[PDB]
Amino acid sequence: TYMKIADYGQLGEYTCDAKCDAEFGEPGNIRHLEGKTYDYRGVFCFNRKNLQ
Amino acid sequence: MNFNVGVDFPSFIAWDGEESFPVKVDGFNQFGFTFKTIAALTAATTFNIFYHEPSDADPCVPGPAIRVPEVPFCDTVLLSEDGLAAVTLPETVTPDSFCAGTVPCMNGQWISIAPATGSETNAANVQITVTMKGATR
Numbered sequence: 672t673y674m675k676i677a678d679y680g681q682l683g684e685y686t687c688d689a690k691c692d693a694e695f696g697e698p699g700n701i702r703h704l705e706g707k708t709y710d711y712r713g714v715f716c717f718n719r720k721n722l723q
Numbered sequence: 724m725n726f727n728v729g730v731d732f733p734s735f736i737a738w739d740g741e742e743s744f745p746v747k748v749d750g751f752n753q754f755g756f757t758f759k760t761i762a763a764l765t766a767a768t769t770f771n772i773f774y775h776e777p778s779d780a781d782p783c784v785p786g787p788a789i790r791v792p793e794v795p796f797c798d799t800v801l802l803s804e805d806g807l808a809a810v811t812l813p814e815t816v817t818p819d820s821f822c823a824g825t826v827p828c829m830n831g832q833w834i835s836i837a838p839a840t841g842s843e844t845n846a847a848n849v850q851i852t853v854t855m856k857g858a859t860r
Contacts, residue, residue, distance in 0.1 A: 687794065687827075687829075688828070689794075689827050690794050690828065691796070691797045
């Protein structure tokens with residue numbers, strides 16, 4: 672499992688002057704993904720008579 | 724030895740008493756009004772403020788008329804109903820002195836003044852004009 676950064680998002684605008692205030696902007700996003708591991712198998716046999 | 728104070732703070736007509744007038748405030752960076760009367764007043768007239776955006780048809784024609792949102796200072800306990808900063812000229816003002824108002828935050832390229840409703844009949848005897856301060860060309 673691993674993390675991912677969706678988008679940093681906007682934070683803070685060009686506010687005017689003489690404005691005793693601020694703006695909260697818009698927070699980003701951080702997803703959390705994960706993935707498995709798949710297996711690969713098979714079989715093969717003989718007759719043990721010609722192998723000798 | 725009067726300096727030609729036209730350049731270095733020019734001025735324009737905003738409200739002559741019959742029809743408003745947009746003024747370009749892009750080339751400059753600091754502006755203000757000087758309200759003036761001609762005759763005695765009645766119940767205090769009020770004034771709307773407006774800002775324009777360059778109409779996309781031509782980047783040098785003022786577009787429609789939009790009203791400027793109001794901002795309060797640190798100690799402003801008397802906010803209007805809506806925002807949309809307005810100016811109410813206090814009556815009892817003889818033509819021997821004036822007033823000097825200005826919006827504290829510019830937003831647009833053309834400032835416009837218009838009398839709000841229920842003031843027109845008493846607003847035809849007021850005389851508004853605007854003057855810049857910057858150069859920044």
